[PDB]
């Protein structure tokens, strides 16, 4: 029942903080979008009206 009973919570706060400020200073590169094509068709059996 002293300050030794808060290390895990302090470490959790540290994890969150370091992730946050490491993301903040990151420089972002604008990726080029490729692979855009109509290759998502659907199949099936023909109905082929009889008569």
């Amino acid at each position: 029942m002293a300050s030794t009973t808060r290390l895990v919570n302090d470490r959790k706060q540290l994890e969150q903080q370091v992730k946050d400020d490491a993301r903040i200073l990151a420089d972002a590169r604008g990726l080029n979008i490729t692979t855009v094509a109509n290759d998502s068709a659907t199949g099936g059996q023909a109905i082929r009206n009889v008569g």
Binding site: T42, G43, G44, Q45, I47, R48
Partner: protein, 50 residues
């Protein structure tokens, strides 16, 4: 001079005469594929979606 004493002839004959060049145009109908195109790949049920 090339036929004979007895001649063969025709009683009636039909032809069309026109007085103005404008009368030489007529009309026909079409389908206008631009707005009502011909169909392909008839209606089918869905199966093998990929």
């Amino acid at each position: 001079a090339v036929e004979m004493y007895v001649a063969v002839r025709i009683s009636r004959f039909q032809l069309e005469v026109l007085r103005d060049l404008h009368d030489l145009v007529r009309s026909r109908t079409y389908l206008d594929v631009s707005k009502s195109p011909l169909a392909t790949t008839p209606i089918r049920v869905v199966e093998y979606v990929r």
